[PDB]
Structure formats: C-alpha cells, structure tokens
C-alpha cells in the first residue's frame, strides 16, 4: 500500500487528472563525467530507489523494471544549444500528464555538450514519488557513483515506511497526539506570484541574537514575525499556520527516495498581553513539538477535528525551510498557488521565497510584505 504522504498527492492528482502542478522538475548540472558514466550511474540509482519505478493500480504500488524508466540522451553542439534543449525539456515536462497507473513516475533527459566536461540532467517525477530531501539524496549518491565510490545498503523502503505507519495507526498513538492538538486548534477550525528576496545581513544577525538570548531556533523567530505581520494585517489575534516537514522521523528514513513530506498546523497567539520573548518561546516550543511528531499525518488532525464537530482545518498560510565530479541540483518551481501565501527560507545568506495567490498579491505587494517582515524581525530583536 501507499503511505498517507504518498496517497494524499496521488489522490489529489486523481481529482484533477489534467492538473500538472504535481510534476516536480529537477535540473542537475554535472561537470567532470562522461555521458556513458552518467547514464550508467543513473540506471543504478533507478534500480536502487524503487519509488522512481512503480505503477499504481486503483491504491496499490507495483514495481517496474529499471529499464522501463525513459531516459533520452541528446548531444548539444555547444553550451547555448544545450540551454535551448533544457528549456525545451522544461516546458515539455511541465505540461506532461503522467500515466501513474501504467508507467514509471520518473523520466530523465540527459544533455551532453560536445567538447565540454559539462552535462545536464533534467529529472521530471510526480510528487507522489519524490520530495525535496529525495533530490539531495539523489544528487549526493550520483556524485558518489560518478567518483567511483560505493553505496551502502538502504535501511528501509517506501513499502516498509507505509507498513510501519499502518501499525502506528492501528496502535492509536498517532491519533492520540492528533486529538491533543485538536483541542488547541478547535477555535480556528489558482494563479500565483513567486518572488525570491535575500534576507538582509542585519535581519540575519538580529534573528540569530534574538534566538540565542531566548534559546530557540532562528526559524522560530522568523516564523513568529511571519505570523505577526500577517495576523496584524488580517485583524486576528490567532493565526493558523501550516509548517512543511520532511516527515523523515527515524534514521532509517533519512536516505530514502520518495514522498514523505507532511504539513502540520500550529497556532500563533497574537495577543498584545504576552511579551515578545514569551510569544517566541511558545512558537519555538510548538514548532519543536511538530518536529518531534513529524510522523503524525495531517489526516489524523483532520479526523480529530471532525470528531469535535468541525468540518476540517482551513490552512491558508504555510511556511518551510530548505574535489571530484561536480554535481548541482535545483528544482524548477511549480507555478500556481494552492495556498494563499507561503514563505520558504533557503540557505546560501538566507533567501526568502514568497509565493502568494495572484488574487491578493502582485510582485510589488510581495516586496512590501518582505520589507514588513524584515522590519518586524528587527523590531522583535
Ligand atoms: C494569506 C494572507 C492574507 C493577508 C495578506 C497580508 C499582506 C500584507 C502586506 O501586503 N504587507 C504587510 C505589506 C505592506 O506593509 C502593506 O502596507 C501593503 O502595502 C498593503 O496590504 C496594501 O497592499
């Protein structure tokens, strides 16, 4: 069977079969390897990571052979021609509808430049079989094989992860955590614009000093100012904020390729009664609680809320944080905006990636929102 992390994306795809916003596109840039070596290493990674080569019967996964994953190889006359071939592949793979019932969820395009040590790999994979950490695992093991190294035995599989979850659900310990959370969250129960903006050095240092003298993670300070600015504009004293989590709750899950991401809600109180340092401590603690219980699926919290008389949980805002052969891997952002507004922090200083629904945000309003967020952080510190 599929895990609930895999199922929620597979189900959402079945609800809108022509929606391509679950297609993940990863561009890998490789320097110092031959085309034959890259193709050979890629086939080993496909055999190693079964999630990249399964089909789904209407929902039961079934493994396919590694040679059944399409891999196209093209020779570019020069570096600019290689750019045009990748851009063509980006547009084509972004529009492709995956046949998840009969074909592997992954496709590969290897572009080699003549008289050059640079190759270019475009990996398109449906989101039910991939996530952000999977790309880092994939890119790291690619460089390992291209360097001549060896890979260790995998500790688990997506099927084992789904099995352990089936047990933890029947044991009821996941629902008991969700039922506790449902108490705190009960009162609260498209075209998009994306803009990446650097976090200023002063805001970076203020966020660290505020986090050190308060004994919380700097992300907690960033999440607090994030919730405070939006809650002030919204006119509410309580703000529901989803937190994107890697969902890899054990050591055996840290090296798997597949879909394990989870979205869990927390509530930020915006009462002027509480101090700034105390609201930060409450946010940092609730954040650590979500990280400690990453394996509690979102459907359990929804189940617990519907048991208390609510129709569901309307999450509108969310946030998250991201020698030898040279390998760089970067996702190409998915267009659209399922949620009204998300903030993602990535490392280099840090980089703030804002995605807002176009009905509320244009690019200029996003820049103003980023500045208000930086000011709130400097003020909070
Ligand atoms: C799902 C989220 C829904 C709520 C969205 C809240 C957007 C907040 C925002 O835009 N700022 C804080 C930037 C600036 O400080 C403001 O003065 C704008 O100019 C003002 O809103 C006019 O555009």
Numbering used by the authors: 822, 824 to 880, 885 to 1015, 1031 to 1163, 1173 to 1198, 1201 to 1233
From the study:
Non-ribosomal peptide synthetases (NRPS) are multi-modular/domain enzymes that catalyze the synthesis of bioactive peptides. A crucial step in the process is peptide elongation accomplished by the condensation (C) domain with the aid of a peptidyl carrier or thiolation (T) domain. Here, we examined condensation reaction carried out by NRPS AmbB involved in biosynthesis of l-2-amino-4-methoxy-trans-3-butenoic acid (AMB) in P. aeruginosa. We determined crystal structures of the truncated T–C bidomain of AmbB in three forms, the apo enzyme with disordered T domain, the holo form with serine linked phosphopantetheine (Ppant) and a holo form with substrate (l-alanine) loaded onto Ppant.
